[PDB]
Amino acid sequence: APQQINDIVHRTITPLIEQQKIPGMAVAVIYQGKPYYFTWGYADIAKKQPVTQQTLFELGSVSKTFTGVLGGDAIARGEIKLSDPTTKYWPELTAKQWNGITLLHLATYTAGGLPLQVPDEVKSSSDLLRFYQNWQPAWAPGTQRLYANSSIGLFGALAVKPSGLSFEQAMQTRVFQPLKLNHTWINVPPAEEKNYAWGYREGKAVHVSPGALDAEAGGVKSTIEDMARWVQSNLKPLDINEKTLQQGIQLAQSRYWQTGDMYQGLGWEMLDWPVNPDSIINGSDNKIALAARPVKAITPPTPAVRASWVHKTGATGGFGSYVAFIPEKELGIVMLANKNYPNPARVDAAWQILNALQ
Helix, strand or coil: CCHHHHHHHHHHHHHHHHHHCCCEEEEEEEECCCEEEEEEEEEECCCCEECCCCCEEECHHHHHHHHHHHHHHHHHCCCCCCCCEHHHCCCCCCCHHHCCCEHHHHHCCCCCCCCCCCCCCCCCHHHHHHHHHHCCCCCCCCCEECCCHHHHHHHHHHHCCCCCCCHHHHHHHHHHCCCCCCCCECCCCHHHHHHECCEEECCEEECCCCCCCHHHHHCCEECHHHHHHHHHHHHCHHHCCCHHHHHHHHHHCCEEEEECCEEECCCCEEEECCCCHHHHHCCCCCCCCCCCEECEEEEEEECCCCCEEEEEEEECCCCEEEEEEEHHHCEEEEEEECCCCCHHHHHHHHHHHHHHHC
């Protein structure tokens, strides 16, 4: 791995692992259409299994990027429009508050205060309906961003209705397979369990226990290799064979809303390049990325801006992920760890590395 990459990667990631006390970590640096991989520590501490390029990590909310891109491809197929009312794909949703709530709203956390989580109480088809019927908006549509799984998760479930496929099936056949993401899963099959890292919360081995719409909101598990390929795909969408998937990626990186220096895409979030690390570093915490924020509509949305920092953070109980890339430099990074550690740290480290390579 070229002197410039090797130097900066090892200088940056080692101290992080030590200070955050991460049991196992994998990293990919994408540099001019080539991935370079790095691994440290353990996927399973008790059985002394190392991290490899075949270790599966829980992506958590980095899964929203796949959801955003699958929705994007549904639009490009002319199956859905972001401008369509939610009501058109869930007619039972009759309550008056849903009238001007569009698929765009759902996809971008701007429906008017949909809650962060679907209640654990929700278990059936009709349970979930009651939940969305009885939800009471704090705000009119398209005025405030509140980060929410109940919002983009519903977008996920609806965006695949006209196909007739289940969400997992649509994701597998329209996104995973065409991009050769052969070790990326919503449900990990028994054959891959040996590669499935344990996450660590308070020194305890844990795996995520999905409730309603977690598949759509945070249920993807992937390897460092498939994640680099996913980053490559997002960096250069026009090199992609399947026409709608190519469009779908581009649509996921369009800028629909602005809040501060941040622009909301489908799943992805973007800033203008070059950026102030401090602008990103303090745009993620338990009270920053999970805050109510007024948005300005971008009228009409800017299509994918090559001069951007495109990124997403994600976590589960036992895991912590980060992905970032800059299309104009053919550069990006993925960071997968089996401990949920502080977002600012993740961004700090990603920043150090890509800045020096660019």
